[PDB]
């Protein structure tokens, strides 16, 4: 429902699978394949 | 043979006589299209005589008695009469062949229609859109085939070779098409149809291989698509199959046939192309053109032509088959006069039944209209029947073995002769181990530059009696300058183009020459489909030696040693003396060559020049623009010392200077129109300047060298050192598309300015420096070093900040995802259009663009990819695809043109709030001085809870919330 896409698109599974697949279609020429994934906010990232 | 095979042959004789030969004019031999259309089309006449030629061949393979000889002779001479009549139709227009030879304009083309009673012209040039390279090419192809089958002045031979030059440049010539209406929109717009290109390739092969393989490049790039404004044309069967067989890729032929079957084939034939509307009940019969808004109307109700199923029987006979389903499905023939099949031209959805057919595709019982019988289709029907019933063989209709195109051709071994320019050079080459022969020793074989070869062909085809002036000066690529030539009984070998072209900085770099040689060898190993083995003459000049002169360049040695080893350039190479290569070479014989501030007074300001060589040059633009070929008052002019400066910096090889001097002296690459024509030959558009849109002038069609060069100059807006970069990068892209075209997949509009900017950025982060000092060190790159940068740009090879770099690399290369354009077609059905930077991609485009067109692609890439910044664009690309992603779950449609940038930005404002809270430095987020998008957003990965595409999903949902008040999502 729209509210879920606005709030947390990723958790909802069906949509995430779509998001991850779209990430690859666009960017799998750059491919652990994890580079195309960002689950850390850059702060916990740039923490070390 | 008269027991049970002569009676059926006589039955087919009655068929051809009562359908085709009854209408042949005894004066001219031409065939009128129908009772209403009394004119004679070139292509229709050529195709309609195929049944007569096949019958004559049948009759002859069994001609022993007189009567049978009489019938065979009558049929063969009817074919000869028709072709001769078409010849005098073309011969009367020798002034048009000559004019089209140099200026390939639609107003200077051979007419398609001719008066069937006088071989004259019926309508004016302006009145039919006469440019149809396929008609002239099919005429030439079947003239070659009929002659090779035994069917017989030199003046008409000269005319035929001038026609070879006429159809020679068909890979870069816009056409009105096989359907003589240009593009689908139907506004008389000349367009490049693969049908014409393939037919021209077949005609040239049957009858210079450089333009042949240029046509081959067009075919590979365009297929399975027909042209720019056509997803698929059923006329492509005339290229991937009988009669051209111009595609040697079996997979490509199968894919084109499958596309035709899946998209155009219906219950009553195959539609010519999607949204054709030639005889649909929705068109205006008395209106010649088509408004862009009525092309939708033609969808799913296009007229199905039985003519194309004759092509599907012909292939199936040419290639053995149980496609006896294409036959037995042609029960849709008019009369069972007496019982004559009378193959119709097309079937149209009955008018009342438009809605049912639209909705339920290929299902309504259509009516036959148009020509009856379609003689072009009827002749192919009779020929296919003949061939299928055993009265004919593929080898009789095709004595030139055009059918054997699809067979894999083995790699060719390019014999190369390395020739020393001088004997000292030969001595150096030997100290290093390459045993060669000097150009003097190779006598009586005479080595000449490729310019001489191009000039020699200008004397081929000349009869001044009918005012025909040879062949236009065309640059001979590696393919042309790889055969040996027998000119006046002495063998002439010609060095490749890239050696004699020493007028731009590319030739000074020996690595460049190595790279050009490698590209030429890679092109040769793949594109040589000629009798003989190709021979590249590679003379080692004095410029190819090192600084001392007692040693050879390392790069040139290494290349020569690899060639001696058999492999260089993806090609197997045999090196040896040129004398050994005579017996196994394409020794073609050229028989036409046989004889028979303050103080504005610039009085004394150049006195400062009389040693840094940079400053000496710098002053020289003040003294050029302010004071270029003007005097210096020391027996010297501004141009002279700039040339002296150019030579000095070439000797010192400080490449920044050479480039600048070249830039202010307006040095231009001679084979640059070839580079642009090659890049456009592969269905890739080009844009030439820095990225804001007006400067970046797009190149949609080939351009002559003067225009191309002039377009480059005005795209720099006077800012020097990019106008040379445009040419150099264009050349490099041409070489890389000739050698590694996979690198150029998912790329359709090469932005040279964005490419240059991304090379500067890469030189800034690799060999870390300022972006500016890097923009200046990009000048100081060797031409081969810059080509390497471009390779690495394309392939994405590396020598927390990564994702910004990628977003930049892909955006500058204008790389789109696979299926991206078709996905954009899908959202345009939902929304009323997309808006990027205020420019609108309206949904009305889909009403005249089928999703798979390379004309809709261009429409999209002109509204989206125009974005200056490299990354903003790649984000706008994501926001479109997340719009595509969420359009499926969304069940409704919105009446707004969606502004993608906002979705990008709304995601931007959603990037500050989330990252600040998860808790990140406020200064960690930095806005862009060009796009206003946080740098960390670019650095973010696509997927994830904090991925950039997820933010756009949280943005598009928060964007269409006010447009779509309610969203019953799936
Ligand atoms: C169900 C709602 C969403 C998944 C939010 C994102 C979708 C849109 C904002 C509209 C998409 C529809 C188009 C025609 C583009």
Instruction: Please state, in angstroms and rounded to a whole number, the distance separating the CA atoms of residues B538 and B524.
Output: 14
Chain B nearest CA to A37, separation (Å): 5
Name the residue facing B941 among A7, A29, A36 (closest C-beta): A36
Instruction: Give every CB contact of residue B504 below 8 A, 6+ residues apart in sequence.
Output: B662, B667, B668, B669, B670, B727
Tokens of B295: 């092309």
Q: Which residue of B has its CA nearest to A39?
A: B944
What CATH code is carried by the domain that includes residue B218?
A: 1.50.10
Tokens of B222: 């365009």
On whether both B751 and B855 belong to a single domain, the answer is no
On whether both B184 and B264 belong to a single domain, the answer is yes
On whether both B854 and B880 belong to a single domain, the answer is yes
Q: Is B928 helix (H, G, I), strand (E, B) or coil?
A: coil
Residues of chain B positioned with their CB less than 8 A from the CB of A35: 802-803, 941
Cα distance from N-terminal residue to C-terminal residue, chain B: 72
Instruction: Please state, in angstroms and rounded to a whole number, the distance separating the CA atoms of residues B835 and B883.
Output: 12
Question: Are residues B817 and A23, on separate chains, in Cβ contact within 8 Å?
Answer: no
Q: Which residue of A has its CA nearest to B923?
A: A43
Residue A32's alpha-carbon distances to A20, A27, A28, A36, B842, in angstroms, are: 14, 14, 11, 9, 40
* Cβ neighbourhood burial of B105 (10 Å; 0-12, 13-18, 19+): middle
Does B953 fall in a domain? yes
Instruction: Please state, in angstroms and rounded to a whole number, the distance separating the CA atoms of residues B128 and B180.
Output: 8
Tokens of B936: 């960390």
Instruction: Give every CB contact of residue B239 below 8 A, 6+ residues apart in sequence.
Output: B194, B195, B197, B198, B199, B202, B219, B246, B247, B256
Neighbours of B225 (CB within 10 A): 22
Does B777 fall in a domain? yes
User: Alpha-carbon dihedral of residues B76, B82, B84, B90, nearest 10 degrees?
Assistant: -150
Can you give B53-86 as a three-state secondary structure string? HHHHHHHHCCCCCHHHHHHHHHHHHHHHHHHHHH
Instruction: Give every CB contact of residue B209 below 8 A, 6+ residues apart in sequence.
Output: B479, B480, B527, B528, B529, B530
Where among B593, B617, B643 does a domain terminate?
B593
Cβ-contact B590, B485 below 8 angstroms: yes
Residue B917's alpha-carbon distances to A9, B698, B913, B928, B951, in angstroms, are: 18, 45, 6, 21, 15
Q: In what order do the strands lie in the sheet with B304-305?
A: B265-266, B269-271, B304-305, B346-348, B367-369
Number of DSSP helices (H) and strands (E) in chain A, helices first: 3, 0
Cβ-contact B342, B272 below 8 angstroms: no
CB of B933 closer than 6 A to ligand 1?
A: no
CB of B951 closer than 6 A to ligand 1?
A: no
Q: Is B156 helix (H, G, I), strand (E, B) or coil?
A: helix
- Classify residue B323 as left (phi > 0), alpha (psi -120 to 50) or beta: beta
Name the residue facing B943 among A1, A7, A36 (closest C-beta): A36
Spell out where chain B is interrupted, by the residue before each break (C to N > 2.5 A): 152, 207, 336, 596, 610, 627, 799
CA torsion through residues A31, A37, A42, A46, sign: negative
Cβ-contact B332, B347 below 8 angstroms: yes
Residues of chain B positioned with their CB less than 8 A from the CB of A43: 915, 918-921, 924
Neighbours of B269 (CB within 10 A): 28
CA-closest candidate to residue B32, choices B139, B114, B142, B123: B114
> Domain coordinates of chain A in residue numbers?
2-45
Instruction: Please state, in angstroms and rounded to a whole number, the distance separating the CA atoms of residues A39 and A8.
Output: 13
Instruction: Please state, in angstroms and rounded to a whole number, the distance separating the CA atoms of residues B44 and B31.
Output: 8
Instruction: Please state, in angstroms and rounded to a whole number, the distance separating the CA atoms of residues B86 and B31.
Output: 10
On whether both B79 and B211 belong to a single domain, the answer is yes
Instruction: Please state, in angstroms and rounded to a whole number, the distance separating the CA atoms of residues B517 and B519.
Output: 5
Question: Are residues B947 and A19, on separate chains, in Cβ contact within 8 Å?
Answer: yes
Q: What are phi and psi of B538, to 5 degrees?
A: -120, 90
Name the residue facing A5 among B810, B942, B953 (closest C-beta): B953
Instruction: Please state, in angstroms and rounded to a whole number, the distance separating the CA atoms of residues B316 and B324.
Output: 8
On whether both B626 and B678 belong to a single domain, the answer is no
Technique employed here was cryo-EM
CA-closest candidate to residue B119, choices B198, B26, B37: B26
Cα distance from N-terminal residue to C-terminal residue, chain A: 38
Which residue has tokens 């001044």?
B464
Question: Are residues B954 and A19, on separate chains, in Cβ contact within 8 Å?
Answer: no
On whether both B253 and B387 belong to a single domain, the answer is yes
Does B624 fall in a domain? yes
- Classify residue B148 as left (phi > 0), alpha (psi -120 to 50) or beta: alpha
Does B601 fall in a domain? no
Residue B137's alpha-carbon distances to B207, B650, B744, B830, in angstroms, are: 10, 48, 31, 44
Q: What are phi and psi of B969, to 5 degrees?
A: -75, 160
Name the residue facing B941 among A15, A25, A38 (closest C-beta): A38
Instruction: Please state, in angstroms and rounded to a whole number, the distance separating the CA atoms of residues B140 and B235.
Output: 18
Tokens of B884: 């595509």
What is the resolution in angstroms? 2.9
Q: What are phi and psi of B666, to 5 degrees?
A: 60, 40
Strand B265-266 relative to strand B269-271, pairing: antiparallel
CA-closest candidate to residue B545, choices B559, B535, B555, B534: B555
Cβ-contact B813, B758 below 8 angstroms: yes
Does B720 fall in a domain? yes
User: Alpha-carbon dihedral of residues B612, B617, B623, B625, nearest 10 degrees?
Assistant: -150
Cβ-contact B801, B939 below 8 angstroms: yes
Q: How many CB pairs under 8 A join A and B?
A: 115
* Cβ neighbourhood burial of B161 (10 Å; 0-12, 13-18, 19+): buried
CA torsion through residues B62, B64, B66, B72, sign: positive
Domain count, chain B: 5
In DSSP notation, B250-308 reads HHHHHHHHHHHHHHTEETTEEESBTT--SS-TTS-TT--S--TTSTTTTTT-PPEETHH
Closest ligand 1 atom to B957 CA:
5
Instruction: Give every CB contact of residue B940 below 8 A, 6+ residues apart in sequence.
Output: A38, A42, B803, B911, B946, B947, B948, B951
Chain B nearest CA to A28, separation (Å): 10
Where among B563, B593, B623 does a domain terminate?
B593
Cβ-contact B376, B47 below 8 angstroms: yes
Q: Which residue of B has its CA nearest to A37?
A: B943
Instruction: Please state, in angstroms and rounded to a whole number, the distance separating the CA atoms of residues B379 and B285.
Output: 28
| Largest CA-CA distance found in chain A, in angstroms, rounded | 38
Q: Which domain holds residue B702?
A: 672-799
On whether both B298 and B390 belong to a single domain, the answer is yes
Tokens of B78: 């009817």
Instruction: Please state, in angstroms and rounded to a whole number, the distance separating the CA atoms of residues B428 and B541.
Output: 12
Q: Is B937 helix (H, G, I), strand (E, B) or coil?
A: helix
Instruction: Please state, in angstroms and rounded to a whole number, the distance separating the CA atoms of residues B205 and B400.
Output: 9
Q: What own/partner pairs with CB < 8 Å and gap ≥ 24 does B429-436 have?
A: B429/B540, B429/B552, B429/B560, B432/B552, B432/B557, B433/B561, B434/B557, B434/B560, B434/B561, B434/B564, B434/B575, B436/B540
Instruction: Please state, in angstroms and rounded to a whole number, the distance separating the CA atoms of residues B106 and B177.
Output: 12
Cβ-contact B829, B843 below 8 angstroms: yes
Count the residues in chain B: 970
Question: Are residues A23 and B818, on separate chains, in Cβ contact within 8 Å?
Answer: no
Instruction: Please state, in angstroms and rounded to a whole number, the distance separating the CA atoms of residues B131 and B192.
Output: 11
Q: What are phi and psi of B459, to 5 degrees?
A: -100, 10
CA-closest candidate to residue B659, choices B773, B495, B778, B553: B778
Which residue has tokens 């919105």?
B894
Between the CA of B881 and the centroid of ligand 1 the distance, in Å, is 11
Neighbours of B922 (CB within 10 A): 9
Chain B nearest CA to A33, separation (Å): 11
Does B175 fall in a domain? yes
Between the CA of B891 and the centroid of ligand 1 the distance, in Å, is 9
Tokens of B640: 């002279």
On whether both B444 and B332 belong to a single domain, the answer is no
């Amino acid at each position: 429902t729209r509210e879920i896409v606005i709030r947390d698109p990723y958790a909802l599974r069906p949509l995430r699978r779509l998001i991850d697949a779209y990430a690859f279609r666009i960017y799998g020429h750059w491919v652990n394949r994890a580079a195309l994934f960002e689950n850390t906010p850059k702060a916990v990232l740039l923490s070390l | 043979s008269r027991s049970n095979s002569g009676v059926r042959l006589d039955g087919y004789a009655r068929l051809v006589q009562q359908t085709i030969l009854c209408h042949q004019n005894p004066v001219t031999g031409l065939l009128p299209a129908s009772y209403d259309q009394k004119d004679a089309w070139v292509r229709d006449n050529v195709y309609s005589i195929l049944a007569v030629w096949g019958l004559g061949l049948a009759y002859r393979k069994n001609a022993d008695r007189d009567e049978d000889k009489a019938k065979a002779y009558e049929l063969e001479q009817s074919v000869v009469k028709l072709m001769r009549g078409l010849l005098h139709c073309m011969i009367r227009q020798v002034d048009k062949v000559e004019s089209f030879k140099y200026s390939q304009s639609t107003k200077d083309s051979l007419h398609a229609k001719y008066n069937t009673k006088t071989c004259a012209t019926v309508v004016g040039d302006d009145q039919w859109g006469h440019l149809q390279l396929d008609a002239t090419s099919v005429y030439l192809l079947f003239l070659a085939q009929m002659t090779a089958s035994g069917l017989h002045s030199l003046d008409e031979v000269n005319f035929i070779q001038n026609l070879v030059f006429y159809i020679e440049a068909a890979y870069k010539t816009a056409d009105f098409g096989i359907w003589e209406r240009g593009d689908k929109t139907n506004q008389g717009i000349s367009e490049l149809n693969a049908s014409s290109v393939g037919m021209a390739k077949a005609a040239l092969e049957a009858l210079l291989a450089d333009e042949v393989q240029h046509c081959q490049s067009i075919l590979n790039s365009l297929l399975p698509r027909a042209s720019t404004s056509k997803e698929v044309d059923a006329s492509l069967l005339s290229v991937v199959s009988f009669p051209a067989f111009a595609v040697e890729d079996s997979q490509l032929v199968e894919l084109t046939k499958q596309e035709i079957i899946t998209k155009l084939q219906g219950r009553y034939g195959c539609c010519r192309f999607l949204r054709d509307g030639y005889k649909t009940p929705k068109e205006d019969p008395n209106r010649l053109y088509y408004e862009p808004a009525e092309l939708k109307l033609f969808e799913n109700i296009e007229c199905e032509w039985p003519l194309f199923w004759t092509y599907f029987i012909l292939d199936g006979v040419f290639s053995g088959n149980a496609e006896q389903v294409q036959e037995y499905k042609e029960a849709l023939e008019a009369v069972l006069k007496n019982g004559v099949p009378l193959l119709p031209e097309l079937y149209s959805v009955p008018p009342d039944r438009v809605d049912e057919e639209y909705q339920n595709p290929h299902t309504v019982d259509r009516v036959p209209m148009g020509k009856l019988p379609h003689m072009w289709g009827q002749s192919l029907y009779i020929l296919g029947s003949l061939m299928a019933e055993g009265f004919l063989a593929p080898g009789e209709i095709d004595p030139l073995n055009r059918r054997f195109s699809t067979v894999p051709k083995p790699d060719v071994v390019v014999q190369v002769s390395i020739l020393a320019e001088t004997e000292e050079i030969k001595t150096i080459l030997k100290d290093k181990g390459i045993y060669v022969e000097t150009i003097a020793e190779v006598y009586p074989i005479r080595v000449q530059p490729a310019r001489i070869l191009s000039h020699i062909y200008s004397s081929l085809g000349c009869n001044n009696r009918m005012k025909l002036s040879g062949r236009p000066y065309r640059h001979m690529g590696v393919l042309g300058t790889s055969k040996l030539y027998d000119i006046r009984k002495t063998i002439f070998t010609f060095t490749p183009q890239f050696i004699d072209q020493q007028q731009f900085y590319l030739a000074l770099d020996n690595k460049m020459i190595v790279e050009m040689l490698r590209t030429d060898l890679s092109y040769l190993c793949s594109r040589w489909r000629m009798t003989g083995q190709p021979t590249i003459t590679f003379p080692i000049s004095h410029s190819m030696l090192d600084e001392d002169g007692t040693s050879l360049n390392s790069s040139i040695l290494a290349a020569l040693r690899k060639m001696q080893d058999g492999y260089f350039g993806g090609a197997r190479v045999q090196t040896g003396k040129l004398s050994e290569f005579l017996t196994t070479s394409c020794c073609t014989h050229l028989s036409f060559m046989d004889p028979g501030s303050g103080e504005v007074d610039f009085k004394a300001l150049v006195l400062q020049l009389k040693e840094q060589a940079d400053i000496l040059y710098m002053l020289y633009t003040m003294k050029g623009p302010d004071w270029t070929e003007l005097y210096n008052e020391r027996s010297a002019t501004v141009r002279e010392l700039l040339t002296e400066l150019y030579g000095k910096v070439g000797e010192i090889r400080h490449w920044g200077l050479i480039r600048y001097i070249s830039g202010i002296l307006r040095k231009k690459v001679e084979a640059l129109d070839e580079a642009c024509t090659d890049l456009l030959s592969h269905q890739k558009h080009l844009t030439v300047g820095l990225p804001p849109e007006p400067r970046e002038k797009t190149i949609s069609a080939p351009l002559p060298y003067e225009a191309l060069t002039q377009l480059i100059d005005e795209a720099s807006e006077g800012d020097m050192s990019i106008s040379i970069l445009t040419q150099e990068i264009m050349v490099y892209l041409a070489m890389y598309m000739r050698t590694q075209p996979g690198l150029f997949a998912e790329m359709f509009r090469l932005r040279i300015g964005l490419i240059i900017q991304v090379m500067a950025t890469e030189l800034a982060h690799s060999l870390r420096c300022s972006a500016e000092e890097a923009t200046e060190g990009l000048m100081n790159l060797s031409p081969s070093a810059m080509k390497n940068l471009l390779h690495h740009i394309l392939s994405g090879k590396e020598f927390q900040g990564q994702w910004q770099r990628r977003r930049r690399l892909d955006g500058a290369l204008n790389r789109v995802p696979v299926g991206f354009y078709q996905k954009v077609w899908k959202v345009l059905q939902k929304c009323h259009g997309l808006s990027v930077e205020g420019f609108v991609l309206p949904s009305s485009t889909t009403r005249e663009m089928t999703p798979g067109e390379i004309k809709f692609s261009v429409h999209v890439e002109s509204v989206l990819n125009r974005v200056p910044q490299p990354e903003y664009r790649q984000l706008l690309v994501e926001a479109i695809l997340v719009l595509t992603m969420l359009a499926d779950i969304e069940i409704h449609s919105i009446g707004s043109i969606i502004a993608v940038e906002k979705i990008v930005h709304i995601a931007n404002d959603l990037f500050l709030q989330e990252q600040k809270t998860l808790g990140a430095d406020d200064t960690m987020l930095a806005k862009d001085p060009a796009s206003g998008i946080c740098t960390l957003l670019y650095d973010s990965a696509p997927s994830g809870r904090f991925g950039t595409m997820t933010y756009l999903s949280k943005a598009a949902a928060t964007y269409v919330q006010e447009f779509l008040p309610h969203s019953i999502c799936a």
